[PDB]
Amino acid sequence: DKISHKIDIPDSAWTIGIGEKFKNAGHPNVKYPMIDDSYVQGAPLGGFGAGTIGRTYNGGFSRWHLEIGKNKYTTVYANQFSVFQKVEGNKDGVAQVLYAGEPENGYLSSWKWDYPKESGMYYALYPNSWYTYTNKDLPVQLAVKQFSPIIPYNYKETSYPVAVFKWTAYNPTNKNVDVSIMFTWQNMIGFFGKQVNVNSGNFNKIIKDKSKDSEIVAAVMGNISNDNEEWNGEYSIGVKKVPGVDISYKAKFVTTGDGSDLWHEFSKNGILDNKDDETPTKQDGIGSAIAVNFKLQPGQTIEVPFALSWDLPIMKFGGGDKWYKMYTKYFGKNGKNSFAILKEALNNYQKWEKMIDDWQKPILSNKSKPDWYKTALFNELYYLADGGTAWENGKVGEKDKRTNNMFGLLECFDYNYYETLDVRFYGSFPLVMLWPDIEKQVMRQFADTINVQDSSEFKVGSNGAMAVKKVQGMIPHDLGSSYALPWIKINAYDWQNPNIWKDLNSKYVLLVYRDYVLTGKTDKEFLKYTWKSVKTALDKLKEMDKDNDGIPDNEGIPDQTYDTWSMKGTSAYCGSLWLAALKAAQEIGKVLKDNEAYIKYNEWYKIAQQNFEKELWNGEYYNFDTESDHKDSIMADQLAGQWYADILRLGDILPKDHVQKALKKIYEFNVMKFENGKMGAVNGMRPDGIVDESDIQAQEVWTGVTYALASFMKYRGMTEEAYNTAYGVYKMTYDKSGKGYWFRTPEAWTKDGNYRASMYMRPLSIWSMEVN
Ligand SMILES: [Ca+2]
Ligand SMILES: [Cl-]
Ligand SMILES: [Cl-]
């Protein structure tokens, strides 16, 4: 490994061997079908709302999120980087696909598959990832850095459907070596969302941009149709000329053949035929290839950038709506703009790298923080782009343009709901902290639904009863499903009735006030916009106080985010959120000079606080609730209200002494008595030190709950406990001794390490650990 010298991989990058087999991998622990794509994953490529592509540590383009809101795991074998090398003086060179595996479908038999084991490494620190190739049969050593310009406080490049592949090659040997690097790509028009003749009309064209000192050669892979089908658009791959490198190309090879049309050229001397052919295909799949060839002298280094773009301008959801994706604002909507996107990337990638560096460096250079923490903090952000993210720039065939661009991130793929608010309470820290204009947009979207009334009925999954879809004054669980109508038809979720949840309205208010606080307490307009919805939300919750203790009553069913775990009476969880929400609304009242509201919420808070304290404080911790069989369980999340109050600078809603004791209890029990504190905080433990069996969710660790708990610990000066607590989640996710959930962090696991709901929004809450 002489190539690690020649590139700058941060020490805190997640790392694994190319072709490594992992033995310990967890699987779903539920009886219903649940996604399990295996541990062969990697950092995603693609911007917010662009659709993302998961290129795994083995080199394959395998996890396809190009259809917005869907997860399709399948390796498109034609999509690869390959290398040719010939030592000066030898008769023959060698050619190798940089993929640790081979096709399962008979095609491309001529290519050299099965990249050997123990011959290179994969590294990731999102949005960056790297491959190193250190192969006894490749005298020139190779590395690539790949990324998308995911950049905080930037809403432009961050939207781009583009990836850069920055290659470094170095000759440590005593003889000259001829090297070729070749990028192949399948014309994947028709791969998603086309019912018949999936390849029909696909054609490929080569663009040579000869602008002086900025020469680019690219393939554009599209379709003859100029219609605006949601499957239509273009892919582009290409390369920028650098001194000392020659470019070659092949416009059209058949992907549904043996591959020799291309490979007989590449394997001979690493130079392609440069054959252009714009003839559309009918049945056969087709692809394009871009290569560079160069001679490396002893001790010489060369750097050459490739790029990939995809212009798929329209997203269609199952309910029929068709929307333009955000990046269309910058490149156009007609689906014929792949080359422009690619070119912007090839000409600006260095600037993008520095912008990413500028953002990561304050954290990476902080020598007080361990490497594992950094690994998790950055790599958890994968989900922001990878979470079925929808970001619209107009409905298709809309006359009126709007000022606003609606956004949504999925709960997960198994539970296909946009912006599940009970979850985003945890999972939206990165958006408020790094892309706050999106965050405020999302919360305006929630404000606008408060008073929506939809009197149509639905069957509640848990119990069979009928219920009203949306009630005036009750915040929605979610903003729809990719299978239906995102943003238009809310409350796609039906497992419980969210119109009687006791956490949604409180969390809504807490999120509003959070978003004001963590954007510098200057955005009075946002408070004005949301003020009425805040008062409605709290006033409707007050009415669910059946027993006149000043606090909404849990109703002996799962009426909150723990949607199989029944709460009854006053709960620590919903009770503390309520206290915190009342305190936040008082503060908003002071800010907006609304004396009537200040007085009302202050009075409500004083009564509720005293009653909460008297009903739940047992002298060690706050009981789970007042009326359950399991009322004295120790709930990891029992003081969620106070956690938020710390972030929102609302002071003590509960006495400092009691908080400290509760947190110590949770660490001693829920953490340290659960598999020795190596796997997070189990949600419910009995006071005798055995896990609560009342419901599966009590027996689960929730990744997003544990990261949030860790931040609460940290704010309260329990530094060791905080990081020890978080460490278990890191360990399970990323470590060789864990369960193999990198780039698919799940909601939850049980004691045995098996999981529920991979690729989940809630653990983005690790960013609460960075709160200033
Ligand atoms: Ca009550
Ligand atoms: Cl256009
Ligand atoms: Cl360390």
Numbering used by the authors: 31 to 802
Sentences from the paper on this structure:
GBA2, the non-lysosomal β-glucosylceramidase, is an enzyme involved in glucosylceramide metabolism. GBA2, like TxGH116 (the bacterial homologue of GBA2), induces hydrolysis through the conventional Koshland two-step double-displacement conformational pathway typical of retaining β-glucosidases, progressing from 1S3 to 4H3 to ultimately adopt the 4C1 in the covalent complex. Very recent publication by Shimokawa and coworkers reports that a GH116 exo-β-d-arabino-furanosidase from Microbacterium arabinogalactanolyticum termed ExoMA2 shows similarities in structure to that of the GH116 β-glucosidase from Thermoanaerobacterium xylanolyticum (TxGH116). Both enzymes have a two-domain structure consisting of N-terminal β-sandwich and C-terminal (α/α) 6-barrel domains, the latter being the catalytic domain.
To firmly establish the mode of action of β-d-Araf cyclitol aziridines as mechanism-based GBA2 inhibitors, the 3-D structure of the GH116 bacterial GBA2 homolog, TxGH116 from Thermoanaerobacterium xylanolyticum in complex with β-d-Araf compound 2 was solved at 1.9 Å resolution. The −1 subsite of TxGH116 is well conserved relative to human GBA2. Electron density shows unambiguous covalent reaction of 2 with the catalytic nucleophile of TxGH116. Reacted compound 2 is anchored by several hydrogen bonds. The OH group on C2 interacts with NE2 His507 and OD2 Asp452, and the OH on C3 with OD2 Asp452, NH2 Arg792 and OG1 and the alcohol of Thr591. The OH on C5 is hydrogen-bonded to OE2 Glu777 and to NH1 and NH2 Arg786. In addition, the amine from the ring-opened aziridine group forms a hydrogen bond to OD2 Asp593 and to a water molecule (which also interacts with OD1 Asp593). There is insufficient electron density to allow modelling of the end of the octyl chain and the azido group, which extend into a more open region at the edge of the protein where they are less constrained. However, both the hydroxyl groups on C2 and C3 of the cyclophellitol-configured aziridine form hydrogen bonds to His507, whereas for 2, only a single hydrogen bond is possible with the side chain. In contrast to cyclophellitol aziridines, which mimic the 4H3 transition state, β-d-Araf aziridine adopts an 3E conformation which resembles the 1S3 initial Michaelis complex conformation.
